[model samples]
Target: MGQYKKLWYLLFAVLAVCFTILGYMGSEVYKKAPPYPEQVVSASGKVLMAKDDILAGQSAWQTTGGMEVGSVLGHGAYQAPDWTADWLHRELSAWLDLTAQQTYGKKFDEVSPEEQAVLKTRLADEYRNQSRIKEDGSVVISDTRVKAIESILPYYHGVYGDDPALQTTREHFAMKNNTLPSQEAREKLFDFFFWTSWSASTNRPDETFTYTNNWPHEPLINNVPTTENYMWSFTSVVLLLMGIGLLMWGYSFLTKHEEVEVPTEDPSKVQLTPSQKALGKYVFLTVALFVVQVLLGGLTAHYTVEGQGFYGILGFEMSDWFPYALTRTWHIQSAIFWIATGFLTAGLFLAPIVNGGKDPKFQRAGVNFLYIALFIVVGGSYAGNFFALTHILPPEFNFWFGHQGYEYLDLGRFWQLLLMVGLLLWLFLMLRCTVSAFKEKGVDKNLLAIFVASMVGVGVFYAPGLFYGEKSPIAVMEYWRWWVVHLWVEGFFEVFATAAFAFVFYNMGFVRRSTATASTLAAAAIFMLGGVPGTLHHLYFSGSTSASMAIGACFSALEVVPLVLLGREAYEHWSYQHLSEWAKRLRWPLMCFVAVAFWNMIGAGVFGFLINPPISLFYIQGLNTSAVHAHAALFGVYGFLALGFVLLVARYLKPNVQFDDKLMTWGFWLLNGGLVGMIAISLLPVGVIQAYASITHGLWYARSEEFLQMEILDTLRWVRTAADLIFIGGAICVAIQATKIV
Candidate 1:
């Protein structure tokens, strides 16, 4: 092993301790804030009004969305006074009698100046920060805002309750400024607090109100909301399952153990060709899907920036009246399709070869059924996504159709059904082929364990998301979601992918069985032991117990350690005298394998650990920093390996096939480098600035438009855009090479 490998282990040990402390401290921070307290007030003044009736079931601030003048954030709660306007109505109703104005000297319009001043003081004072109401209804204190309102109250004087000035005061001024509530019931409640009780924040509430609203239970349409919104989650799980299967298959192929005898009467069927054209055709389809996926992604990217896709014409309501959301959904679904198809089609096609070239028709039928089902599933999916995205489809179609923005973003219904079909097909084929293979010869317990583990992985990884529903608490929902994402990626998927890669190499006569089996199992153990417990790293943000966080951090460190160690081991393995000659081609493939370990530890494990800690996440969440970790670990480790594995397969199938290797390599360089540039110069700075703004300035007060328009964005846009250009170039190279192999 290279010296760098040991250094990697050392780095993980240090990271473990650092994350452990950070996660622990974050829990403490959350614990310090007591839950928001309900308020109770007692009437203390000469007034005979009961405080219990007015201050029931209310918090200090009924709603946290007022204050239009933008106070110095955190100075005081931006309390939008709800009761001031209602008080005007009730008090003036008794005094003015607008319809019988002649009886009271034309009511408020003709009232004495002193009486009007007294009324104004009571109303205006109640709206201010330090509202002070005298016993006889005189305002001795007001916020600066109340002083301004008082100056204008005279000029825009109202003629009792019906005055248009009341409209101007409440709608155009105070309400616009977020100084008062907008509704009648809330306003009535606020009036009781302001008039009957003073400084309710400091007073204990003698009454409590029962909140009866149950909007959370309302259906998306008239029917029931469903698991349809969880499709992205479904797709995520599907990717992991496919990853596990491929990992074992690839490893077997690489080590020359994967084979199935053609079931013809002739046992000596050595003259049969491996059907290079079939392979080539499939590769082209995969590559084409990938190319289109990028185009869709580019369209989505532009839409995100401009809110208009493809010349503002080809948006959601393009040909066939597709909605903008549909356009975006197709892009995401297609991206998943292209990549996952590569995993499935390739796995199914190679299953016979891996099982010593024995084609099982029942297994084949299942595989074909999965493919056909996907077409139907994805087709319906496209329509459904369109509906969900724009929410423009007639409400009748909403059952299986459209949704509004936030509601539709999840990947639940169609994705789950389709992936289940795919998973079933995979399991049947793998088990059938494995069973038949052992019948023909014998089975290795280790290899059999890898396959079974992968099957179990599909079930375990995806089952959690199914449990997510309205009744499923948010805490549990988040926990299970992490169970899917963290456990699958960190545990089963990692192990399976490593094993499959070795299996693929073994089948193709590229490596020794001992080397492939022993090394892969070790890698699998490393990934699993480290991965399963490391799930807590995600829990820091999910409101998990502190013990969970500590366990997660410690395990997360283990996830990275073995991968880094193995990267060096691959190089040393090839440096051995017998394998030294094959090291030429092995350099890149082996290095590519090593790169997987290197980045998993660095990008996925280490950097991931850094942000997983509670204190760090508390500061960085909802910022560009979170995006940094997601973009890197997602594409760098998983994306790169998937692409590389396809390339390796193509090369093994036909080494002499013409391909733009330079372009392929160039694309890799551009992708990795561009991603780095985007992270460092663009995303990182934005994350830090945004985090400080949100934490220090308050959530609603921190203005983002100005930041985007300022110096940081000025240079950042051009650099990242330039990097995107390179990335596009690399994507093009990837497409061309893959297509040629097809």
Candidate 2:
């Protein structure tokens, strides 16, 4: 411990510096972000669109489950179109028609074949050039382009209102007729779409890249790859592969050196305190939500197959009852909810053990209260989102107590606030139970301290979601949203995960305290160095400055570096369980942790880096490419971590019960095998094809109905059904075993 003191000092210093730089860089980006105007005017000073209408339209969009129903800026559910790409295509067509009328004395569709080719060449060049915004917030654009945009606004209005001609497109996109009850909301929806499209077309000041770095990959708008985008993407992948090789080399040597092993505790002899018993309810909540999440995930996927048609079979009305938006919202929320429940329950269970397996006076009551509070918030928030989507909640109240419509934070303001309070309460309870461990000498103190810090972070990071209102500038909202999304999942969540697993390993005597402390701290250092600032990766196409893109690309690549070590760690853990009978007692849990290692390297590390570079994400964001990373990382890493924790707690709770090891083994393989099959056969290939189409053809074609509904792509999508069924079977087996424990 004494020799490691200096190493700890260096680790803390590096962490402090990383966070400081992250704060400074993020603030700089936020300060320089564009303030979209209340009204947009053309270069000739003619008002084209008002700000109020755009904002109101966005509010209406939220009620319809904005991102979940269709994407904006290339982020959202896949069954629908990328609204930004759709708008860019529509605007370009309008501009081309007007050009033909003026130059060739005919509508674009009526022009001679040779003349129409010329119009295509001319309008292509014009739309590709950057539109500018003046200091006074007036957009500098040609009078003809502005008039074209105004002309197309009515078309969007008609689509949102479910006009006859647009019905085919609407049904293909899973939008039902008369979805937007408010006429003003329909017009305003167009306003929001136009504004985002403008941002997509307009380049930033003093830069060749558009405000979104020419993202969405529209050839019509000349949104092609930049040199930096290409250069960074190539280097990042190559270097990451090299890092993996180097780490494996080091791992081979490290494992040969024998280290002291702690004495193993008897699982049958271990007993839970009263406070620990109080945590049982949360485990049920976790497992139940896990099942629900899988169910909803299947429904969300089905929405893409036939849109509202339900396999194109007449008289199937499931779409009206379980719309794409609602199913998707529940799918995302359930994943978050269940995963979080597992983490929280594990913390409550472990804290008392750290305090000598004794219950503090306040621990039991506090745990119960926290569970009730959590249930209320999750249930109330979900109901509100559903009611808001169904028009049961007024638009005014939707943002407050219904759905705010942001992914992960879709719960309304009231629920979000309550959630913040609940997290704080949970943190306090954990502190009360674990504070004594900090006073102990040696690595136990250090390990417990790290665990506490991570718990604190889980609560603290969620605070950022409450910083902005629903109507705040999209850039600002996105900036903070990623703070919660990336930081929570990739950053501090990793911290907690490593520390928790290390603590559990130490308790089981598979590893010495020194080894656990050192490795946990090392992983934390690596994750923070990359993960803190790497958040900029998600911001590149969200109207952020170029500084973010450069910073995000460089740091996010480093995220893969630490994962290179996971292979070695996983091998060691796997070898340790086979060494002795006592270690074998915890085989299932350790195996799950091993899966975490595998995923940390492959899913979060490999697949994650595939899109980490700005160029790759420019075409891949919101496509199945992201789904490849999301499903792999979220389920592969955290999902397995949660399951590992559950198995550990269950072992402690019913040590002598002799649960079915066969089911655990079967469940484990099925889950991993299904996930691999799902990604390899479906998501990865589909995503790559979509990205190729986006890069070569245009973003509009890639996400449009024609491209998505192709026979090949549809077959690829349906391939997920086999994998999903297998995965669901695995989950059911795990749940059955879990319920049998007590």
Candidate 3:
């Protein structure tokens, strides 16, 4: 088993290296490379015919057409007309250079009857050399031998043509196949192949020569690489959440059909000691980080509304220096502390029970190390974020503690792996002392299923993304990331979900699992079917074509359908039962759960579907539109789940720790209300308006500083400001209430 564990670690290291390589390579391959405008003109030349100059045969002013309207006014529309009557432009300079060294000098186009076959070699060489830099450093002439044809500026009027703009009438030589005679004649050619031809003339005192020089080629589009992969970070958040969630599931799996009747607290049984009390104190310390982090979160949001940070009024270096980066570091530190608290809380609760309710010196060491490790991780992250932001230390080590940007979230991944190791150690101790309630009797199938599901689901979600060879596409990566993320929280989490519930209920002598069993299996099926394709929903605005859009809608719909039904079942069947004693302890947690379900439908499902539509996403792709969806789905499902689970765990671990129930109830209301207000009235509205403006008008054009000149940003700014205040107040109350209980 140890060797197997070592092998898994080896596999993980190799996988990490692979992911790094593949991610770098994929980013490189997909990067956009645009064509230089200089190259276009050098290939084609200006022609002079009559030389009236301003309105002559063709003019130099025609090449000045901007990219958006290039296709109407032909090249050299501003050039002079000389000897030849035709108002055309050709690569005459390129032609001159081509035939300059020729033993049998004749222009290729001029000698094209049957002699064209003999000049193919010269034509190829001339075309290749003309492809270099032009007279001005700004452009390059790729094929100087090619003729200039019409269709360069589509939205501008031609100097010679009688049309609103030569947009449609101009010949589209660029669209021609030009590969083979048959292919060239094919109508299936793209617009990129077309070229605009203009006359080029050389005068010799009455006898003149003229030809076409057309340069009509569309510039290539370049794709900007993602500097911050929030989606990947978001998925990683989900994976970490699921890992903790699965550990809870395994504990729940142990409880059902495996009750050990304590031998009535005989004098022979060991008394709870100072170690237990200290363990309890550690739990309190861990929980305190939650309060600290929430405050940091509130301050971060506050800074967004006000230019002033949390301590900015005091002229503090921490607040004024890289305020955003500082706030992010604090938030990230808080998250690590929060998760650490949770692990320590679990450890404190479990160590006693694993030692047959007897305190052990060895277990004490484990608890001590857990806290110390947490302190180092948090301190390291803070130092790293600070240095990285200040440009003192390289950002690479930021993952060890924390990072400056949203990338701060990745540090949480390190903490998560550490916690997983802690858990395996904890699990070993639990297995050693606790006589299986099912050593004689068989294990409960439902409990076993949920446990296995949690482990398998997390493994499935996280293990693959760790590798590179066949890395999941962004869509599927998110799908599996969330599957690893939300599924364990919703699906397998029911293991701990039920275990925590059952532990309390069994202690209270109440029965468990009236109808949730059938619903669980049904919910699993729906999740799988809907979840796999729901990944595409994320890709809707990510340049994925139309086909990806439809597939995303269909499967993502399945996730919502079952969740709603599950919510209804929980309300109707579970609530209606005589479980009020269980309900009293569960009142807040269960309500929190139901609230989570309701908002999840609104946040991840309804709201998400709106943006996934092609028409809406065109404007919102790189904007805050998706941020709205992410916050809702992630918090609605995972956040709520974590909150409720904490509340549930408190009931079993430290029921006597005095909690102000009235304050908590109100805090819960305020928290939920504030979350809704932030998303709906403020953030959602801003996102929608931004999307409309960005899509219809240009990005800058929609802003007050640009074309729109509307102070919409100012109008909406206050709404966000007020929402942040409400949220902070509620969070503060909740934190105070949580600390007293822990």
Candidate 4:
């Protein structure tokens, strides 16, 4: 306890300080958020697009798929252009062309290079120098730019109007028509997009840099990085290298100490408690949701490629019932639900076993109730999202019973509150057994302590999902959303996984209890130090200041440090497969853990750092490169971890329940191999092309309709089908293997 106690306290301190700094920065987001103009009027004192227009437009964007359909400030699923970046580029391009013809008697592209340069400067100046908010919250933009904004209106109108032919037919830019059917709503969306573009280009007060730090990297309007972007980018990489070297040194030295050995024991000798047996239903639900998630993932991919989703081939017209936006929403939310279910199921199954096979009073009932609540919450949330997205519910209910519009935290307020309560209930049941375990003389206090602390972290962090309300500023909503998404996935969840596996390893005598416990605490502290405050990385251009960006970049870069060391864990997990045949019941689960460790390094570490730098993300934020990182890291690491837990728990069901190793083997290889093929064959190559477009052209062209329809892009997008089917097949196979025991 003495040595591990020091690390426990250190982790607590690190968590406290990191979250405190993050809290302070979050407060800064509200204060420094982009101002909302009461009115945006023409020079002749006529109102065009006002404050209500912009806010309401933002709401409209959500119904049409929010970030999934397009993006704002470089956040969201990539398909359509990031509206902010695209609007800025489009306006500047049009203004230069119009001014060139009117002033120099030539088209913009036809004009002399010198004249084109002059128009560029003039175009950049129109927004960069002139646009600002007045004393009464009136936004000022030059008339020509306002005319540019007017021209943009008709294009969006065509995309969302009553006529299907008028709607966008660009290849792979599948969007729901009439999402903002009314003229008022469509006009409002333009203003919302216009204001966002203005914020990207306009200088902050007297500063030369925009409020977004010159994000979007658009050369057309001189939209690129500020000095702060490059400065922070450099230091972040330096710290990342030093962090890696430093951790390597410390871990190397720590190996000099010898750990006392223990007798190896197999848990298969023990029978399941009633509470443990109740988790059988969770296994079935987990696989069911996993199948749904992957299925939607494939459908979302098709929409991104073929737009109508095999309609010509099958005449299914699934988009009529399930639009691209709703499909993507369900795809994302399904993964969230299934992964969470897997973790909760495994945790509940494992807890009492750690308590010397003891179950508290009515523990089985508690497990059953949790399962029911999860089912209702999941079903209700899905229904609410569908109803709201399709306009079946009163628009106002969208915030209460329907979708919240924010990715990851999309559950409505009521459902989110219920889910948070469910998490707390899970924590209570976990803590009850942990408390009893503490009273057992032979229990490993260090493992129990870390487990309990991480479980508490899970419960507390999710509470932030319910913080932002209806009409909350996008900046603030996105900030809090990362607390729930980033911190949970990258920080607490990682900690919990480490501690849980260490407990299992120690119990199996694969490692000394002291080594397992101490290592878990050490890993947790290092991860929290970077992972907690690394939330700022997502806010670099979300209307936050330079300080937040610097903090985020530096800390986010350090996140790669611990991941490099996970290679050791992968080898360590691989070692477990050979411990003993009787001790080998968890063979495939160990294999899954090994895959998790491999992907944790490659996906979360290698690919993550590729975009962690401020300047890198400046260009790569919404590109295919991000998709590569997300696919590899999110599913590659976290998804595998969740699956491992599911497989591990399934092995612990009734002693007489026979298992199928061949099916397990098939599932394991397929899941890992299919993911690799998907990354290599599809997501990465397309992402590379997108990154090239973002850097050389601008963030706009990277996601522009013209560029998105390139022959190579189409081929690459279609090639994903082979891997998608394979991965889905593998997920199904794994589902079969796990649920078969139920």
Judging by TM-score, tell me the better candidate of 1 and 3: 1
Candidate 3: clashing residue pairs, number:
53
Model 3 residue 627 lDDT? Answer: 54
Whole-model Cα lDDT of every candidate shown, in order: 0.45, 0.79, 0.41, 0.80
41-155 in candidate 2: lDDT tens per residue?
6667777677777788778888888787878887787777888888888888889888888897888888888987777767655554535666676655678888787787776
Query: Best candidate per TM-score, number?
Result: 4
Candidate 4 per-residue lDDT over residues 667-705, each given as its tens digit: 878888889999999889988988887889888888888
TM-score of 3: 0.56
Candidate 4: Cα lDDT at 64: 59
lDDT string for model 3 (462-537, tens) is 3332222111222223333333333333344443443434433333434334223333343444454455445444
* TM-score, every prediction: 0.60, 0.93, 0.56, 0.95
Predicted structure 4, TM vs. truth: 0.95
Q: Which runs in model 3 stand beyond 4 Å of their true positions?
A: 1-287, 305-320, 329-368, 395-408, 412-439, 455-516, 540-551, 573-582, 613-615, 698-710
lDDT of residue 65 for candidate 3: 14
Rank the models by TM-score, top first: 4, 2, 1, 3
